[PDB]
Amino acid sequence: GMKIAILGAMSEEITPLLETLKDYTKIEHANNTYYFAKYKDHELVLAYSKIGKVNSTLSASVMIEKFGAQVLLFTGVAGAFNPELEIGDLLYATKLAQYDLDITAFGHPLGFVPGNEIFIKTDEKLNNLALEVAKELNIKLRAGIIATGDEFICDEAKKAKIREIFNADACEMEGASVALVCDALKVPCFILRAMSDKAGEKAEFDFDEFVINSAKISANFVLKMCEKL
Amino acid sequence: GMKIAILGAMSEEITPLLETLKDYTKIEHANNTYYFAKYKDHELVLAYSKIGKVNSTLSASVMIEKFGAQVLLFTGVAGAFNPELEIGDLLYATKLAQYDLDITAFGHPLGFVPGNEIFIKTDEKLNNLALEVAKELNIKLRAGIIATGDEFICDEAKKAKIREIFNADACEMEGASVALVCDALKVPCFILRAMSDKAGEKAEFDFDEFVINSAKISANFVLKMCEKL
Ligand SMILES: CCC[C@H]1CN(Cc2c[nH]c3c(N)ncnc23)C[C@@H]1O
Ligand SMILES: CCC[C@H]1CN(Cc2c[nH]c3c(N)ncnc23)C[C@@H]1O
């Protein structure tokens, strides 16, 4: 009966969970709304953070430090880099980096600042739980590296560069920051993304067309994981 | 009295305060150390966050949500954009933006995400307090706009662009994120920076030469502000 945080970046990523849960209580905090529900005897706290690294860092910190979350599941969409990924495919992050954290003028690798590492890992036990849920429900699930930064990527050259440097399978704007917070606060973290676009030419149009559906796929999956916790 | 958080990004920005305080208690939390001291009968919490937006967001969130800080003073160094600023000069931020928060592909202004604003303001009463301290101690103090992002700027073209878009007087990697956290959590925030470099060609060398001294200037000033709180 651990307290579980479920976090997305946008309303579209969390609204499907709220509609499935049906009954919940709202609390205004940190210029946002935090939702509280009981799901199959688990206390849940849910929110969308708003877009980007700072917003998602704040929400993760609030869910743990203020509301006492003991596990955090992130659900949302992402831009696909690995050519085997199609729109709608699920990817969980084994590790994540910030591609736009840059003090390389002083000789450091891209994504590195003193005191930290380039990559942050997610929780092994949660990742193994996800694999058993995927097997149980006959859902295709890929493991990979996610590159996080505060830009919407819609450029083939930029995509290729980030993929080359970090061996990244997808990009988004919240994962590495959320995973960093959870690691710092000793909370098991799981980062799941469904592909909404391929992060190249006209990715903005694919995102618009597929965000609602891809968000539902990821949302469903994390709610099934809550059952096995 | 109110509980005061004093936050920097690097050891160089906070160590001068610790040496002045002499006596304090260290607590390991959020993969970092938080320092607790009494200064002229004011309860302080101090830390350096480590570099960048995510790290500084986390520390500000911890200081407020976990440790109950009621006011937050940020102290450190910055890269000067306004040509009237010289190395060592003090600038407090009236407002701040994230120059590298970019969903402009969907038509939004640079620095904007839905639910937030382009600029975040600092606390008027703290800024006026700083002006009285500057007058009292005969210290030159300038007000300006600070642009925040996760890159060390050492490029005249980048400097010119950020200055043009945001009317920014200086740049750094933590201010807008810290100010955003404080605003979200209803905590008065003050952001003070002493110039370490001019953010152009060979800014890395100027930073190295002047960081220790510039950091001490900012650190001294925020400690004097604590006396008037
Ligand atoms: C408004 C769009 C930005 C949302 C969607 N989300 C994930 C994402 C999907 N496709 C992406 C791409 N091509 N680049 C970056 N990130 C993403 C990150 C922000 O919360
Ligand atoms: C590795 C050094 C970067 C430190 C110093 N700090 C302020 C700063 C001074 N000069 C700057 C410039 N030209 N660009 C960005 N930021 C800065 C931001 C990071 O915490």
Angle CA B57–B150–B173, to nearest 5? 60
B47: left (phi over 0), alpha (psi -120 to 50) or beta: beta
Half-sphere exposure of B205 (CA within 13 A, CB side): 4
Residue B64 and residue B5 in contact, taking contact as beta carbons nearer than 8 Å: yes
Let me know if A86 is a catalytic residue. Answer: no
- A contacts of B198 (beta carbons < 8 Å): none
User: For residue A205, how far is its CA from the centre of ligand 2 (angstroms)?
Assistant: 36
Beta strands in B67-203 (DSSP E): 71-80, 90-98, 120-121, 141-148, 170-172, 189-197
Within 10 A of B40 (CB to CB), how many other CB atoms are there? 9
Ligand 1: centre distance to CA B38 (Å) = 45
The nearest CA of chain A is from the CA of B75 a distance in Å of 19
Q: Kind and range of the H or E element at A22?
A: none
Q: Which residues of B touch A180 (CB under 8 A)?
A: 54, 58
Structure tokens that stand for B138 in this block: 């005969």
Distance B44 CA to ligand 2 centre (A): 25
User: Which residue in chain B is spatially nearest to A152 when comparing CA positions?
Assistant: B103
Distance B117 CA to ligand 2 centre (A): 24
Query: From the alpha carbon of A103, which atom of ligand 2 is closest?
Result: 1
Element (H, E) at B157: helix B156-166
**How wide is the angle at C-alpha A67 spanned by C-alphas A226 and A3, nearest 5°?**
25
> What are the residue ranges spanned by the domains of chain B?
1-229
- List chain A residues with CB under 8 Å of B62: 61, 65
Q: Which H or E element spans position B44?
A: strand B42-48
- Would you call A160 an interface residue with chain B, using a CB distance cutoff of 8 Å? no
Q: Tell me how far apart the alpha carbons of residues B161 and B186 are, in angstroms, rounded to a whole number.
A: 32
Asked whether A8 lines ligand 1 (CB < 6 A), one says no
Here the contacts of B24-31 (C-beta below 8 Å, separation 24 or greater) are B29/B62, B29/B66, B30/A184, B30/A185, B30/B58, B30/B59, B30/B62, B30/B66, B31/A183, B31/A184
Compute, in angstroms, the gap from residue A79 CA to the centroid of ligand 1. 6
Contacts of B20 (CB under 8 A, 6+ apart): B219, B223
CA B167 to chain centre: 18
- Annotated catalytic, B197? yes
CA end-to-end span of chain A, whole Å? 8
Q: Cα separation of B76 and B9, whole Å?
A: 7
Establish whether residue A51 lines the binding site of ligand 1, counting it when its CB lies within 6 angstroms of any ligand atom: yes
B115: three-class secondary structure by DSSP = coil
Collapsing DSSP states into helix, strand and coil, what is residue A32?
strand
Q: Which of A144, A178, A154 is nearest to A49 (CA)?
A: A178
Q: How far apart are CA B149 and CA A101, in angstroms?
A: 9
> Which chain A residue is nearest to residue B175, measuring alpha carbons?
A54
Any ligand 1 atom below 6 A from CB of A172: yes
Find the residue in A nearest to B32 (Cα). Answer: A184
Which of these, B4, B66, B14, lies nearest to B39 by C-alpha position? B4
Residue of B31, B184, B185 with shortest CB distance to A184: B31
User: Contact at 8 Å (CB) between B37 and B24?
Assistant: yes
Task: Answer for the pair A149, B103: CB distance below 8 angstroms, yes or no.
Answer: no
Q: Which of A12, A172, A174, A197 is catalytic?
A: A197
Q: Which residue has the tokens 């955003």?
A: B180
User: Are A106 and B204 a contacting pair at CB < 8 A?
Assistant: yes
Q: Pull the structure tokens for residue A218.
A: 């990821």
Name the catalytic one among B12, B169, B172, B197.
B197
Instruction: Give the start-end residues of each E strand in chain A.
Output: 4-8, 25-29, 32-39, 42-48, 71-80, 90-98, 120-121, 141-148, 170-172, 189-197
Taking the CA of residue A114 as reference, the ligand 2 atom at the shortest distance is 1
The alpha carbon dihedral of A11, A13, A14, A19 has a sign of: positive
For the A1-229 domain, the top CATH level (class) is alpha beta
The minimal CB distance from B185 to the residues A30, A114, A176 is found for: A30
Tokens representing residue A46 in the block = 């849910």
| DSSP SS3 for B99 | coil
**Count of Cβ atoms closer than 10 Å to residue B83 Cβ:** 9
CB atoms B105 and A204 under 8 Å: yes
Documented resolution in Å:
1.7
Chain A nearest CA to B80, separation (Å): 17
